[PDB]
Amino acid sequence: DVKEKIYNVLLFVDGGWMVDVREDTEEDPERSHQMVLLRRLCLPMMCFLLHTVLHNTKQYKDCLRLADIVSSENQKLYTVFSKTEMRNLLQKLRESSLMLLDLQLDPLGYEIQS
Amino acid sequence: YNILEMEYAQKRSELLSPLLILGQYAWASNLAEKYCDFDILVQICEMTDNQSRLQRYMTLFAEQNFSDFLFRWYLEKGKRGKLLSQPASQHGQLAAFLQAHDHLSWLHELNSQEFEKAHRTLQTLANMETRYFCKKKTLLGLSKLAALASDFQEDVLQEKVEEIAEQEHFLLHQETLPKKLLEEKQLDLNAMPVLAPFQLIQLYVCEENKRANENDFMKALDLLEYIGDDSEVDVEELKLEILCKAIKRDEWSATDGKDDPIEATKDSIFVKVLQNLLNKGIELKGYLPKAETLLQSEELNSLKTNSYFEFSLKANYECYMKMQS
Amino acid sequence: VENTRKKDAGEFAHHDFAPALDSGTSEEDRAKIDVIDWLVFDPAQRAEALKQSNAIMRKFLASKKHEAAKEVFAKIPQDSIAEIYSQWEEQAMDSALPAEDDNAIREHLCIRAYL
Protein backbone atom coordinates (compact mmCIF):
# COMPACT_ATOMS: atom_id res chain seq x y z
CA ASP A 1 0.00 0.00 0.00
CA VAL A 2 2.70 2.51 0.96
CA LYS A 3 4.76 1.64 -2.13
CA GLU A 4 1.77 2.23 -4.41
CA LYS A 5 0.96 5.48 -2.59
CA ILE A 6 4.51 6.84 -2.84
CA TYR A 7 4.73 5.78 -6.50
CA ASN A 8 1.49 7.61 -7.26
CA VAL A 9 2.71 10.69 -5.37
CA LEU A 10 5.93 10.65 -7.41
CA LEU A 11 4.29 9.98 -10.80
CA PHE A 12 1.15 12.06 -10.25
CA VAL A 13 -0.64 13.67 -13.19
CA ASP A 14 0.97 16.53 -15.16
CA GLY A 15 4.47 15.22 -14.42
CA GLY A 16 5.79 16.09 -10.98
CA TRP A 17 3.96 16.57 -7.70
CA MET A 18 1.57 19.54 -7.64
CA VAL A 19 1.99 21.00 -11.15
CA ASP A 20 -0.17 23.96 -12.13
CA VAL A 21 -2.53 23.01 -14.96
CA ARG A 22 -3.23 26.61 -16.01
CA GLU A 23 -0.93 29.55 -15.35
CA ASP A 24 -2.21 32.28 -13.01
CA THR A 25 -1.51 35.06 -15.51
CA GLU A 26 -5.00 36.56 -15.07
CA GLU A 27 -5.50 36.15 -11.30
CA ASP A 28 -2.88 35.84 -8.54
CA PRO A 29 0.65 34.59 -9.37
CA GLU A 30 1.26 34.22 -5.62
CA ARG A 31 -0.65 30.92 -5.71
CA SER A 32 1.63 29.53 -8.43
CA HIS A 33 4.70 30.84 -6.61
CA GLN A 34 3.63 29.14 -3.37
CA MET A 35 2.90 25.92 -5.27
CA VAL A 36 6.35 25.95 -6.88
CA LEU A 37 8.01 26.68 -3.53
CA LEU A 38 6.11 23.90 -1.75
CA ARG A 39 6.95 21.46 -4.55
CA ARG A 40 10.66 22.31 -4.51
CA LEU A 41 10.70 22.08 -0.70
CA CYS A 42 8.68 18.85 -0.36
CA LEU A 43 9.98 16.72 -3.25
CA PRO A 44 13.38 16.13 -1.53
CA MET A 45 11.48 15.21 1.64
CA MET A 46 9.44 12.57 -0.19
CA CYS A 47 12.64 11.41 -1.89
CA PHE A 48 14.35 10.91 1.48
CA LEU A 49 11.27 9.14 2.86
CA LEU A 50 11.21 6.73 -0.09
CA HIS A 51 14.98 6.25 0.23
CA THR A 52 14.58 5.23 3.87
CA VAL A 53 11.65 2.96 2.94
CA LEU A 54 13.72 1.18 0.29
CA HIS A 55 16.67 0.96 2.69
CA ASN A 56 14.50 -0.80 5.27
CA THR A 57 12.80 -3.01 2.64
CA LYS A 58 16.02 -3.87 0.71
CA GLN A 59 15.40 -2.19 -2.65
CA TYR A 60 18.74 -0.81 -3.84
CA LYS A 61 17.58 -1.13 -7.45
CA ASP A 62 14.70 1.24 -6.71
CA CYS A 63 17.07 3.48 -4.74
CA LEU A 64 19.28 3.77 -7.83
CA ARG A 65 16.28 4.29 -10.12
CA LEU A 66 15.16 7.16 -7.87
CA ALA A 67 18.16 9.15 -9.14
CA ASP A 68 16.97 8.82 -12.74
CA ILE A 69 13.39 9.55 -11.66
CA VAL A 70 14.55 12.80 -10.03
CA SER A 71 16.76 13.69 -13.00
CA SER A 72 13.81 13.21 -15.37
CA GLU A 73 12.32 16.46 -16.66
CA ASN A 74 8.79 15.33 -15.75
CA GLN A 75 9.39 16.15 -12.07
CA LYS A 76 10.82 19.61 -12.90
CA LEU A 77 13.85 18.98 -10.66
CA TYR A 78 16.76 20.75 -12.36
CA THR A 79 18.76 21.14 -9.11
CA VAL A 80 17.30 24.57 -8.37
CA PHE A 81 16.56 23.93 -4.68
CA SER A 82 18.51 23.55 -1.43
CA LYS A 83 22.17 22.60 -1.58
CA THR A 84 21.65 20.91 1.80
CA GLU A 85 18.89 18.81 0.22
CA MET A 86 21.22 17.96 -2.67
CA ARG A 87 23.93 16.88 -0.22
CA ASN A 88 21.44 14.78 1.76
CA LEU A 89 20.22 13.09 -1.43
CA LEU A 90 23.82 12.38 -2.44
CA GLN A 91 24.54 10.90 1.00
CA LYS A 92 21.44 8.70 0.77
CA LEU A 93 22.48 7.52 -2.71
CA ARG A 94 25.99 6.75 -1.44
CA GLU A 95 24.56 4.78 1.49
CA SER A 96 22.32 2.84 -0.91
CA SER A 97 25.28 2.07 -3.17
CA LEU A 98 27.35 0.94 -0.18
CA MET A 99 24.58 -1.32 1.12
CA LEU A 100 24.19 -2.79 -2.38
CA LEU A 101 27.94 -3.36 -2.75
CA ASP A 102 28.15 -5.01 0.68
CA LEU A 103 26.30 -7.99 -0.85
CA GLN A 104 28.83 -8.33 -3.72
CA LEU A 105 26.64 -6.40 -6.18
CA ASP A 106 28.08 -3.45 -8.09
CA PRO A 107 25.84 -0.35 -8.23
CA LEU A 108 26.42 0.07 -11.99
CA GLY A 109 22.89 -0.01 -13.37
CA TYR A 110 20.67 -2.60 -11.72
CA GLU A 111 22.86 -5.73 -11.76
CA ILE A 112 26.55 -6.65 -11.99
CA GLN A 113 29.06 -4.36 -13.69
CA SER A 114 29.53 -4.46 -17.45
CA TYR B 1 73.19 -5.27 -7.70
CA ASN B 2 69.62 -5.50 -8.99
CA ILE B 3 69.90 -9.27 -9.45
CA LEU B 4 71.45 -9.54 -5.98
CA GLU B 5 68.63 -7.59 -4.32
CA MET B 6 66.04 -9.58 -6.29
CA GLU B 7 67.43 -12.94 -5.17
CA TYR B 8 67.78 -11.54 -1.64
CA ALA B 9 64.09 -10.58 -1.58
CA GLN B 10 63.26 -14.02 -3.00
CA LYS B 11 65.24 -15.66 -0.19
CA ARG B 12 63.39 -13.46 2.31
CA SER B 13 60.06 -14.60 0.86
CA GLU B 14 61.20 -18.23 1.00
CA LEU B 15 62.28 -17.84 4.63
CA LEU B 16 58.98 -16.20 5.60
CA SER B 17 56.95 -19.42 5.63
CA PRO B 18 56.83 -21.27 8.99
CA LEU B 19 55.70 -18.16 10.88
CA LEU B 20 52.89 -17.53 8.39
CA ILE B 21 51.93 -21.22 8.50
CA LEU B 22 51.74 -21.24 12.30
CA GLY B 23 50.10 -17.86 12.83
CA GLN B 24 50.68 -14.90 15.18
CA TYR B 25 49.72 -12.09 12.83
CA ALA B 26 50.70 -9.45 15.40
CA TRP B 27 54.18 -10.95 15.82
CA ALA B 28 54.59 -11.27 12.04
CA SER B 29 53.61 -7.62 11.59
CA ASN B 30 55.96 -6.48 14.36
CA LEU B 31 58.76 -8.42 12.67
CA ALA B 32 58.01 -7.15 9.15
CA GLU B 33 57.64 -3.50 10.22
CA LYS B 34 61.43 -3.25 10.65
CA TYR B 35 61.95 -3.26 6.87
CA CYS B 36 60.46 -1.11 4.09
CA ASP B 37 57.43 -3.16 3.05
CA PHE B 38 53.79 -2.30 2.44
CA ASP B 39 51.96 -5.06 0.54
CA ILE B 40 52.62 -7.75 3.16
CA LEU B 41 51.43 -5.44 5.94
CA VAL B 42 48.32 -4.48 3.95
CA GLN B 43 47.44 -8.13 3.31
CA ILE B 44 48.12 -9.19 6.91
CA CYS B 45 45.89 -6.36 8.15
CA GLU B 46 43.14 -7.13 5.62
CA MET B 47 43.05 -10.90 6.21
CA THR B 48 42.56 -10.33 9.96
CA ASP B 49 40.00 -8.57 12.16
CA ASN B 50 42.41 -6.02 13.71
CA GLN B 51 41.82 -2.46 12.50
CA SER B 52 44.09 -0.77 15.06
CA ARG B 53 47.12 -2.41 13.46
CA LEU B 54 46.19 -1.05 10.03
CA GLN B 55 45.47 2.36 11.56
CA ARG B 56 48.87 2.58 13.25
CA TYR B 57 50.61 1.31 10.10
CA MET B 58 48.86 4.05 8.12
CA THR B 59 49.80 6.73 10.67
CA LEU B 60 53.41 5.49 10.65
CA PHE B 61 53.88 5.12 6.87
CA ALA B 62 51.62 7.94 5.66
CA GLU B 63 54.72 9.55 4.11
CA GLN B 64 55.18 6.58 1.74
CA ASN B 65 51.65 6.91 0.25
CA PHE B 66 49.92 4.19 2.27
CA SER B 67 46.69 4.24 0.28
CA ASP B 68 47.27 2.84 -3.22
CA PHE B 69 48.16 -0.63 -1.92
CA LEU B 70 45.12 -0.60 0.37
CA PHE B 71 42.84 0.38 -2.52
CA ARG B 72 44.35 -2.30 -4.77
CA TRP B 73 43.92 -4.99 -2.10
CA TYR B 74 40.34 -3.87 -1.43
CA LEU B 75 39.51 -4.02 -5.14
CA GLU B 76 41.21 -7.37 -5.81
CA LYS B 77 39.95 -9.23 -2.72
CA GLY B 78 36.34 -8.23 -3.41
CA LYS B 79 36.21 -5.74 -0.52
CA ARG B 80 34.56 -3.07 -2.67
CA GLY B 81 32.12 -2.36 0.16
CA LYS B 82 34.91 -1.30 2.50
CA LEU B 83 36.67 0.40 -0.43
CA LEU B 84 33.63 2.64 -0.89
CA SER B 85 33.02 3.02 2.86
CA GLN B 86 36.59 4.25 3.41
CA PRO B 87 36.68 7.61 5.24
CA ALA B 88 36.81 10.90 3.34
CA SER B 89 40.53 11.72 3.39
CA GLN B 90 42.04 9.97 0.35
CA HIS B 91 39.77 11.21 -2.43
CA GLY B 92 42.62 12.10 -4.79
CA GLN B 93 44.31 8.73 -4.37
CA LEU B 94 40.97 6.92 -4.76
CA ALA B 95 40.28 8.81 -7.99
CA ALA B 96 43.78 8.15 -9.35
CA PHE B 97 43.31 4.45 -8.56
CA LEU B 98 39.76 4.13 -9.94
CA GLN B 99 40.51 6.15 -13.10
CA ALA B 100 40.50 2.80 -14.94
CA HIS B 101 37.39 1.40 -13.17
CA ASP B 102 34.54 3.72 -14.11
CA HIS B 103 31.79 1.66 -12.43
CA LEU B 104 33.17 2.81 -9.08
CA SER B 105 34.86 6.00 -10.33
CA TRP B 106 31.55 7.69 -11.14
CA LEU B 107 30.17 6.99 -7.66
CA HIS B 108 33.44 8.07 -6.02
CA GLU B 109 33.40 11.35 -7.96
CA LEU B 110 29.74 11.92 -7.08
CA ASN B 111 30.62 11.41 -3.41
CA SER B 112 33.72 13.63 -3.67
CA GLN B 113 31.64 16.35 -5.42
CA GLU B 114 33.61 15.93 -8.68
CA PHE B 115 30.41 16.53 -10.62
CA GLU B 116 32.14 17.26 -13.95
CA LYS B 117 34.23 14.09 -13.84
CA ALA B 118 31.22 12.06 -12.70
CA HIS B 119 29.09 13.37 -15.57
CA ARG B 120 31.88 12.67 -18.07
CA THR B 121 32.29 9.12 -16.75
CA LEU B 122 28.54 8.47 -16.84
CA GLN B 123 28.31 9.81 -20.40
CA THR B 124 31.23 7.62 -21.48
CA LEU B 125 29.56 4.59 -19.87
CA ALA B 126 26.22 5.34 -21.55
CA ASN B 127 27.98 5.73 -24.91
CA MET B 128 29.98 2.51 -24.51
CA GLU B 129 26.98 0.47 -23.32
CA THR B 130 25.96 -1.87 -26.15
CA ARG B 131 23.42 -4.17 -24.44
CA TYR B 132 20.91 -3.92 -21.58
CA PHE B 133 18.44 -1.14 -22.40
CA CYS B 134 17.48 -0.87 -18.73
CA LYS B 135 21.10 -0.37 -17.69
CA LYS B 136 21.56 2.11 -20.54
CA LYS B 137 18.57 4.19 -19.42
CA THR B 138 19.75 4.00 -15.79
CA LEU B 139 23.18 5.31 -16.80
CA LEU B 140 21.49 8.01 -18.88
CA GLY B 141 19.42 9.12 -15.89
CA LEU B 142 22.52 9.13 -13.70
CA SER B 143 24.35 11.24 -16.29
CA LYS B 144 21.38 13.62 -16.43
CA LEU B 145 21.46 14.00 -12.64
CA ALA B 146 25.22 14.57 -12.70
CA ALA B 147 24.88 17.20 -15.44
CA LEU B 148 22.08 18.95 -13.54
CA ALA B 149 24.22 18.97 -10.38
CA SER B 150 27.39 19.92 -12.29
CA ASP B 151 29.16 23.28 -12.06
CA PHE B 152 29.64 23.88 -15.81
CA GLN B 153 28.23 26.82 -17.76
CA GLU B 154 24.48 27.25 -18.10
CA ASP B 155 24.61 26.86 -21.89
CA VAL B 156 26.68 23.66 -21.64
CA LEU B 157 24.31 22.25 -19.01
CA GLN B 158 21.29 23.08 -21.19
CA GLU B 159 22.95 21.44 -24.20
CA LYS B 160 23.70 18.30 -22.17
CA VAL B 161 20.12 18.23 -20.87
CA GLU B 162 18.81 18.54 -24.43
CA GLU B 163 21.10 15.73 -25.61
CA ILE B 164 19.95 13.45 -22.79
CA ALA B 165 16.33 14.33 -23.56
CA GLU B 166 16.93 13.41 -27.21
CA GLN B 167 18.44 10.11 -26.08
CA GLU B 168 15.37 9.49 -23.90
CA HIS B 169 13.09 10.27 -26.84
CA PHE B 170 15.10 7.81 -28.95
CA LEU B 171 14.70 5.14 -26.26
CA LEU B 172 10.97 5.95 -26.20
CA HIS B 173 10.73 4.14 -29.55
CA GLN B 174 11.55 0.86 -27.79
CA GLU B 175 9.64 1.96 -24.67
CA THR B 176 6.42 2.30 -26.70
CA LEU B 177 6.17 -1.40 -27.51
CA PRO B 178 2.85 -3.21 -26.95
CA LYS B 179 2.83 -5.52 -23.94
CA LYS B 180 0.92 -8.13 -25.96
CA LEU B 181 3.68 -8.28 -28.58
CA LEU B 182 6.31 -8.30 -25.82
CA GLU B 183 4.65 -11.28 -24.12
CA GLU B 184 4.27 -13.04 -27.48
CA LYS B 185 7.97 -12.57 -28.25
CA GLN B 186 8.90 -13.58 -24.67
CA LEU B 187 11.37 -10.94 -23.47
CA ASP B 188 9.53 -8.52 -21.14
CA LEU B 189 10.60 -4.98 -20.24
CA ASN B 190 13.78 -4.18 -18.27
CA ALA B 191 15.43 -7.29 -19.75
CA MET B 192 16.00 -6.42 -23.41
CA PRO B 193 19.29 -5.25 -24.98
CA VAL B 194 19.66 -1.94 -26.83
CA LEU B 195 17.44 -2.56 -29.85
CA ALA B 196 18.69 -1.14 -33.13
CA PRO B 197 16.60 1.30 -35.20
CA PHE B 198 16.60 -1.24 -38.04
CA GLN B 199 15.31 -3.88 -35.61
CA LEU B 200 12.57 -1.51 -34.43
CA ILE B 201 11.62 -0.79 -38.04
CA GLN B 202 11.45 -4.52 -38.75
CA LEU B 203 9.28 -5.03 -35.66
CA TYR B 204 6.92 -2.26 -36.76
CA VAL B 205 6.81 -3.73 -40.28
CA CYS B 206 6.11 -7.34 -39.27
CA GLU B 207 2.55 -8.38 -38.46
CA GLU B 208 3.51 -9.27 -34.87
CA ASN B 209 2.97 -5.63 -33.89
CA LYS B 210 -0.47 -4.96 -32.38
CA ARG B 211 -0.61 -1.40 -33.77
CA ALA B 212 -1.45 -0.03 -37.22
CA ASN B 213 -1.55 3.76 -36.73
CA GLU B 214 0.69 6.57 -37.96
CA ASN B 215 2.62 6.54 -34.67
CA ASP B 216 4.72 3.59 -35.88
CA PHE B 217 5.48 5.38 -39.15
CA MET B 218 6.46 8.54 -37.27
CA LYS B 219 8.71 6.50 -34.97
CA ALA B 220 10.35 4.87 -38.00
CA LEU B 221 10.88 8.27 -39.64
CA ASP B 222 12.46 9.56 -36.42
CA LEU B 223 14.70 6.50 -36.13
CA LEU B 224 15.79 7.11 -39.73
CA GLU B 225 17.31 10.41 -38.58
CA TYR B 226 18.51 8.97 -35.27
CA ILE B 227 21.85 7.17 -35.17
CA GLY B 228 22.41 3.56 -34.17
CA ASP B 229 22.24 1.19 -37.14
CA ASP B 230 21.28 3.24 -40.25
CA SER B 231 24.80 4.65 -40.71
CA GLU B 232 26.26 2.44 -43.45
CA VAL B 233 22.81 1.29 -44.64
CA ASP B 234 21.26 3.54 -47.27
CA VAL B 235 18.12 5.32 -46.08
CA GLU B 236 16.52 5.31 -49.54
CA GLU B 237 15.75 1.58 -49.43
CA LEU B 238 14.41 1.94 -45.88
CA LYS B 239 12.11 4.80 -46.93
CA LEU B 240 10.94 2.76 -49.93
CA GLU B 241 10.15 -0.22 -47.70
CA ILE B 242 8.32 2.04 -45.23
CA LEU B 243 6.23 3.52 -48.04
CA CYS B 244 5.48 0.06 -49.44
CA LYS B 245 4.35 -1.14 -46.00
CA ALA B 246 2.20 1.97 -45.58
CA ILE B 247 0.57 1.26 -48.95
CA LYS B 248 0.03 -2.38 -47.96
CA ARG B 249 -1.54 -1.44 -44.61
CA ASP B 250 -4.02 0.91 -46.32
CA GLU B 251 -7.75 0.46 -45.72
CA TRP B 252 -8.65 0.57 -49.42
CA SER B 253 -6.14 -1.58 -51.31
CA ALA B 254 -7.62 -4.73 -49.77
CA THR B 255 -10.33 -3.70 -47.26
CA ASP B 256 -12.85 -1.48 -49.08
CA GLY B 257 -14.12 -2.04 -52.60
CA LYS B 258 -16.27 0.92 -53.62
CA ASP B 259 -16.22 2.91 -56.89
CA ASP B 260 -15.61 6.44 -55.54
CA PRO B 261 -11.95 7.44 -56.06
CA ILE B 262 -12.28 10.34 -53.60
CA GLU B 263 -13.03 9.34 -50.01
CA ALA B 264 -11.74 5.79 -50.52
CA THR B 265 -8.14 7.03 -50.59
CA LYS B 266 -8.68 9.64 -47.86
CA ASP B 267 -9.99 6.93 -45.50
CA SER B 268 -6.64 5.12 -45.59
CA ILE B 269 -3.24 5.44 -43.89
CA PHE B 270 -1.17 6.87 -46.75
CA VAL B 271 -3.14 10.13 -46.91
CA LYS B 272 -2.93 10.53 -43.13
CA VAL B 273 0.84 9.91 -43.15
CA LEU B 274 1.30 12.42 -45.98
CA GLN B 275 -0.78 15.02 -44.12
CA ASN B 276 1.22 14.45 -40.93
CA LEU B 277 4.49 14.85 -42.85
CA LEU B 278 3.20 18.04 -44.48
CA ASN B 279 2.16 19.45 -41.10
CA LYS B 280 5.54 18.54 -39.61
CA GLY B 281 7.50 20.09 -42.49
CA ILE B 282 9.48 17.16 -43.94
CA GLU B 283 9.96 17.23 -47.70
CA LEU B 284 7.84 14.65 -49.54
CA LYS B 285 10.09 14.54 -52.63
CA GLY B 286 13.54 14.25 -51.03
CA TYR B 287 12.82 12.20 -47.91
CA LEU B 288 10.42 9.87 -49.76
CA PRO B 289 10.44 7.99 -53.08
CA LYS B 290 9.07 9.73 -56.15
CA ALA B 291 5.77 9.13 -57.93
CA GLU B 292 7.64 7.68 -60.91
CA THR B 293 9.37 5.16 -58.63
CA LEU B 294 6.07 4.32 -56.92
CA LEU B 295 4.48 3.70 -60.33
CA GLN B 296 7.40 1.63 -61.64
CA SER B 297 7.44 -0.50 -58.49
CA GLU B 298 5.94 -3.96 -58.95
CA GLU B 299 3.91 -3.73 -55.71
CA LEU B 300 1.16 -1.75 -57.46
CA ASN B 301 0.28 -4.56 -59.87
CA SER B 302 -0.13 -6.95 -56.92
CA LEU B 303 -1.83 -4.49 -54.53
CA LYS B 304 -4.22 -2.77 -56.96
CA THR B 305 -7.85 -3.50 -57.81
CA ASN B 306 -8.75 -0.76 -60.32
CA SER B 307 -6.97 2.11 -62.03
CA TYR B 308 -8.89 4.58 -59.84
CA PHE B 309 -6.75 3.71 -56.81
CA GLU B 310 -3.45 4.22 -58.64
CA PHE B 311 -4.60 7.44 -60.33
CA SER B 312 -5.92 8.94 -57.09
CA LEU B 313 -2.74 8.02 -55.20
CA LYS B 314 -0.53 9.51 -57.92
CA ALA B 315 -2.60 12.70 -58.06
CA ASN B 316 -2.60 13.09 -54.27
CA TYR B 317 1.17 12.52 -54.11
CA GLU B 318 1.80 15.04 -56.89
CA CYS B 319 -0.45 17.66 -55.27
CA TYR B 320 1.20 17.15 -51.88
CA MET B 321 4.68 17.45 -53.39
CA LYS B 322 3.63 20.61 -55.24
CA MET B 323 2.13 22.21 -52.13
CA GLN B 324 5.16 21.24 -50.03
CA SER B 325 7.84 22.40 -52.49
CA VAL C 1 -11.66 37.17 5.97
CA GLU C 2 -10.08 40.50 5.02
CA ASN C 3 -10.78 42.02 8.44
CA THR C 4 -9.44 38.91 10.20
CA ARG C 5 -6.25 39.05 8.13
CA LYS C 6 -5.85 42.81 8.67
CA LYS C 7 -6.45 42.80 12.44
CA ASP C 8 -3.30 40.69 12.93
CA ALA C 9 0.34 41.41 12.14
CA GLY C 10 0.42 39.05 9.14
CA GLU C 11 1.69 35.51 8.62
CA PHE C 12 4.33 35.83 5.89
CA ALA C 13 7.57 33.84 5.85
CA HIS C 14 8.29 32.78 2.26
CA HIS C 15 11.34 33.05 0.01
CA ASP C 16 9.57 34.90 -2.82
CA PHE C 17 7.97 37.54 -0.56
CA ALA C 18 9.05 39.59 2.45
CA PRO C 19 9.12 37.86 5.85
CA ALA C 20 6.86 39.02 8.66
CA LEU C 21 6.22 36.70 11.62
CA ASP C 22 7.80 33.26 12.00
CA SER C 23 8.23 31.85 15.52
CA GLY C 24 6.06 28.72 15.72
CA THR C 25 2.31 28.41 16.25
CA SER C 26 0.45 31.05 18.27
CA GLU C 27 -3.12 32.36 18.53
CA GLU C 28 -3.04 33.86 15.02
CA ASP C 29 -3.15 30.42 13.39
CA ARG C 30 -5.98 29.34 15.69
CA ALA C 31 -7.94 32.48 14.81
CA LYS C 32 -7.35 32.01 11.08
CA ILE C 33 -8.53 28.40 11.42
CA ASP C 34 -11.64 29.28 13.45
CA VAL C 35 -12.61 32.09 11.05
CA ILE C 36 -13.35 29.38 8.44
CA ASP C 37 -16.33 28.20 10.52
CA TRP C 38 -18.75 30.68 8.93
CA LEU C 39 -17.45 29.87 5.44
CA VAL C 40 -17.84 26.12 6.01
CA PHE C 41 -21.31 26.60 7.52
CA ASP C 42 -22.53 28.72 4.60
CA PRO C 43 -23.92 26.29 2.00
CA ALA C 44 -23.14 28.64 -0.92
CA GLN C 45 -19.53 29.42 0.07
CA ARG C 46 -17.84 26.00 -0.11
CA ALA C 47 -15.62 27.08 -3.02
CA GLU C 48 -14.43 30.22 -1.22
CA ALA C 49 -13.94 28.21 1.98
CA LEU C 50 -11.77 25.65 0.18
CA LYS C 51 -9.83 28.43 -1.57
CA GLN C 52 -9.10 30.20 1.72
CA SER C 53 -8.16 26.91 3.40
CA ASN C 54 -5.70 26.12 0.61
CA ALA C 55 -4.30 29.67 0.67
CA ILE C 56 -3.64 29.50 4.41
CA MET C 57 -2.35 25.91 4.36
CA ARG C 58 0.20 26.68 1.64
CA LYS C 59 1.52 29.59 3.71
CA PHE C 60 1.62 27.33 6.78
CA LEU C 61 3.56 24.65 4.88
CA ALA C 62 5.95 27.32 3.58
CA SER C 63 6.48 28.74 7.09
CA LYS C 64 6.83 25.20 8.52
CA LYS C 65 3.41 25.03 10.20
CA HIS C 66 2.28 21.61 8.97
CA GLU C 67 0.17 20.93 12.08
CA ALA C 68 -2.33 23.72 11.35
CA ALA C 69 -2.47 22.69 7.69
CA LYS C 70 -3.20 19.06 8.58
CA GLU C 71 -5.84 20.18 11.09
CA VAL C 72 -7.62 22.47 8.62
CA PHE C 73 -7.46 19.75 5.96
CA ALA C 74 -8.87 17.06 8.27
CA LYS C 75 -11.63 19.31 9.62
CA ILE C 76 -13.12 19.84 6.14
CA PRO C 77 -14.72 16.83 4.40
CA GLN C 78 -13.31 15.12 1.33
CA ASP C 79 -16.10 15.91 -1.14
CA SER C 80 -15.56 19.55 -2.14
CA ILE C 81 -13.88 18.52 -5.40
CA ALA C 82 -16.77 16.20 -6.29
CA GLU C 83 -19.30 18.90 -5.39
CA ILE C 84 -17.50 21.45 -7.58
CA TYR C 85 -17.32 18.97 -10.46
CA SER C 86 -21.04 18.17 -10.14
CA GLN C 87 -21.95 21.87 -10.02
CA TRP C 88 -19.83 22.55 -13.11
CA GLU C 89 -21.24 19.57 -15.04
CA GLU C 90 -24.90 20.15 -14.09
CA GLN C 91 -25.08 23.73 -15.41
CA ALA C 92 -24.37 22.46 -18.97
CA MET C 93 -21.67 25.11 -19.53
CA ASP C 94 -18.12 25.83 -18.41
CA SER C 95 -16.19 29.07 -17.86
CA ALA C 96 -13.18 27.79 -19.84
CA LEU C 97 -11.96 26.05 -16.65
CA PRO C 98 -11.12 28.58 -13.90
CA ALA C 99 -7.38 28.66 -13.30
CA GLU C 100 -7.67 29.29 -9.56
CA ASP C 101 -10.34 26.59 -9.20
CA ASP C 102 -8.18 24.04 -11.04
CA ASN C 103 -5.19 25.04 -8.90
CA ALA C 104 -7.22 24.59 -5.71
CA ILE C 105 -8.48 21.21 -6.92
CA ARG C 106 -4.93 20.07 -7.70
CA GLU C 107 -3.71 21.34 -4.33
CA HIS C 108 -6.48 19.48 -2.48
CA LEU C 109 -5.78 16.25 -4.38
CA CYS C 110 -2.03 16.53 -3.75
CA ILE C 111 -2.58 17.26 -0.05
CA ARG C 112 -4.87 14.23 0.25
CA ALA C 113 -2.27 12.05 -1.48
CA TYR C 114 0.46 13.45 0.78
CA LEU C 115 -1.58 12.74 3.92
TrEMBL record, chain A:
Coiled coil: none annotated. It is found in: Chromosome, Centromere, Kinetochore; Nucleus, Nuclear pore complex; Nucleus membrane. It comes from the Eukaryota. Part of the nuclear pore complex (NPC). Forms part of the Nup160 subcomplex in the nuclear pore which is composed of NUP160, NUP133, NUP107 and Nup96; this complex plays a role in RNA export and in tethering Nup98 and NUP153 to the nucleus. Does not interact with TPR. Interacts with ZNF106. Plays a role in the nuclear pore complex (NPC) assembly and/or maintenance. Required for the assembly of peripheral proteins into the NPC. May anchor NUP62 to the NPC. Involved in nephrogenesis. Belongs to the nucleoporin Nup84/Nup107 family. This is Nuclear pore complex protein. The lineage of its organism: Eukaryota, Metazoa, Chordata, Craniata, Vertebrata. The chain holds residues 803 to 916 of 916 of the full protein.
From TrEMBL, chain B:
It is found in: Chromosome, Centromere, Kinetochore; Nucleus, Nuclear pore complex. Residues 1-191 form the Nucleoporin Nup133/Nup155-like C-terminal domain. It comes from the Eukaryota. Belongs to the nucleoporin Nup133 family. Forms part of the Nup160 subcomplex in the nuclear pore which is composed of NUP160, NUP133, NUP107 and Nup96. This complex plays a role in RNA export and in tethering Nup98 and NUP153 to the nucleus. Involved in poly(A)+ RNA transport. Involved in nephrogenesis. This is Nuclear pore complex protein Nup133. The gene is nup133.L. The chain holds residues 816 to 1140 of 1140 of the full protein.
TrEMBL record, chain C:
It is found in: Chromosome, Centromere, Kinetochore; Nucleus, Nuclear pore complex; Nucleus membrane. Part of the nuclear pore complex (NPC). Forms part of the Nup160 subcomplex in the nuclear pore which is composed of NUP160, NUP133, NUP107 and Nup96; this complex plays a role in RNA export and in tethering Nup98 and NUP153 to the nucleus. Does not interact with TPR. Interacts with ZNF106. Belongs to the nucleoporin Nup84/Nup107 family. Plays a role in the nuclear pore complex (NPC) assembly and/or maintenance. Required for the assembly of peripheral proteins into the NPC. May anchor NUP62 to the NPC. Involved in nephrogenesis. Functions as a component of the nuclear pore complex (NPC). This is Nuclear pore complex protein. The lineage of its organism: Eukaryota, Metazoa, Chordata, Craniata, Vertebrata. The chain holds residues 631 to 745 of 916 of the full protein.
